[PDB]
Amino acid sequence: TREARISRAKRAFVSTPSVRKILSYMDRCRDLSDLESEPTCMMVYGASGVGKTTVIKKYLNQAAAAAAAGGDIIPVLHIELPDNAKPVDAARELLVEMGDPLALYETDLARLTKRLTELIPAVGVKLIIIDEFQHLVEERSNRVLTQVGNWLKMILNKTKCPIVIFGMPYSKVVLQANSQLHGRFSIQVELRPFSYQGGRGVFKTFLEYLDKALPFEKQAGLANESLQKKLYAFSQGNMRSLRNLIYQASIEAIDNQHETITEEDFVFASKLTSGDKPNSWKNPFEEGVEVTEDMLRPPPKDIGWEDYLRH
DNA sequence: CTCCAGTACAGCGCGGCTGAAATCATCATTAAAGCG
Numbered sequence: 594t595r596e597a598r599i600s601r602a603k604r605a606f607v608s609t610p611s612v613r614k615i616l617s618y619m620d621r622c623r624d625l626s627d628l629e630s631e632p633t634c635m636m637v638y639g640a641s642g643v644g645k646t647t648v649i650k651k652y653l654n655q656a657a658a659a660a661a662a663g664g665d666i667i668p669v670l671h672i673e674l675p676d677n678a679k680p681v682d683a684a685r686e687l688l689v690e691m692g693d694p695l696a697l698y699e700t701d702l703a704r705l706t707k708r709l710t711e712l713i714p715a716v717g718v719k720l721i722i723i724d725e726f727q728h729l730v731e732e733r734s735n736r737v738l739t740q741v742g743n744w745l746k747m748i749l750n751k752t753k754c755p756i757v758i759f760g761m762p763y764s765k766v767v768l769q770a771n772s773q774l775h776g777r778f779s780i781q782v783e784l785r786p787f788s789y790q791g792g793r794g795v796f797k798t799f800l801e802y803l804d805k806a807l808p809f810e811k812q813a814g815l816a817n818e819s820l821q822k823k824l825y826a827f828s829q830g831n832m833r834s835l836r837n838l839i840y841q842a843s844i845e846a847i848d849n850q851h852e853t854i855t856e857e858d859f860v861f862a863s864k865l866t867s868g869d870k871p872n873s874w875k876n877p878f879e880e881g882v883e884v885t886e887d888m889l890r891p892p893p894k895d896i897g898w899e900d901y902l903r904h
Numbered sequence: 905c906t907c908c909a910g911t912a913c914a915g916c917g918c919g920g921c922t923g924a925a926a927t928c929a930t931c932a933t934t935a936a937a938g939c940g
């Protein structure tokens with residue numbers, strides 16, 4: 594098995610230009626906010642499985658590895674909002690995250706704000722990052738709760754720490770609720786999936802950078818004339834499912850004697866990870882499924898919005 | 905301060921009533937054909 598090759602095949606990262614555009618903007622946000630005056634407050638979108646958490650873990654690596662190895666400073670922070678977040682609920686988890694506090698046996702929402710606003714200059718927080726903004730909409734109706742939104746405006750105007758919010762593409766109507774939240778968050782971006790399969794894409798260079806990143810030491814055989822056809826036939830532009838199927842083929846090749854990912858084990862990888870796909874999506878690998886041109890069609894605009902049509 | 909209970913307020917769903925539209929009855933009127 595040689596589990597080093599397995600973990601080294603799973604932990605692989607390809608920097609598409611949108612990702613480095615993002616990380617450049619967050620360093621821009623980090624040492625552009627001067628902690629004297631009003632911050633910049635970027636907002637990042639992206640659908641399910643487009644690489645968001647990988648982006649922020651890249652960011653806390655390249656921004657906080659040496660400063661977390663040096664001492665208890667914690668300049669950048671990483672937060673997910675729990676579902677249907679009460680303002681005291683999000684505030685207390687954001688508080689027990691940073692520092693070494695006890696911090697949550699009292700739930701009073703004024704005095705823990707006191708403790709968090711005295712601690713946010715005490716350890717020297719350079720940036721606060723929130724992962725999951727779509728948790729503030731109701732399940733069965735599309736009312737949105739902005740107790741946490743006005744609380745986040747309060748902690749923004751209290752201490753001038755920059756905030757970078759990630760979230761689903763349907764989570765922006767929450768920002769359409771509070772207009773002061775809408776104006777305070779100026780930079781919204783678009784981390785949409787891979788666009789086309791027609792040729793000379795960013796998809797190409799991503800694919801062959803992943804190919805040299807793979808643990809097989811000669812060639813992976815991928816990013817070819819017909820392979821990206823069935824690859825884009827399998828995953829829409831969907832980064833998580835593409836990488837998942839690729840990893841599930843790579844483990845199958847390293848289970849036995851195999852020199853590269855080839856045409857006997859990539860099929861069984863299509864057999865496993867075909868579960869999340871819809872019924873009208875077509876299964877292209879086993880016996881005779883040639884792929885029409887309409888099925889490599891680019892992803893629509895409401896690609897991170899199908900959590901929202903039904904209600 | 906937190907959990908449980910009571911009680912108010914708000915919301916959704918179901919049922920009943922009312923209104924409108926569609927269909928069927930019902931006959932009435934008009935026209936054509938046959939008989940006187």
Ligand SMILES: Nc1ncnc2c1ncn2[C@@H]1O[C@H](COP(=O)(O)OP(=O)(O)OP(=O)(O)O)[C@@H](O)[C@H]1O
Nearest residue numbers: 605606607608641642643644645646647832833836
């Ligand atoms: N730049 C990249 N290069 C290689 N693989 C990547 C890249 N970005 C993401 N992946 C793969 O995609 C998978 C999904 O990553 P991630 O969870 O960050 O997406 P996401 O949009 O945050 O999904 P969710 O929002 O549901 O957490 C990861 O397992 C990772 O291996």
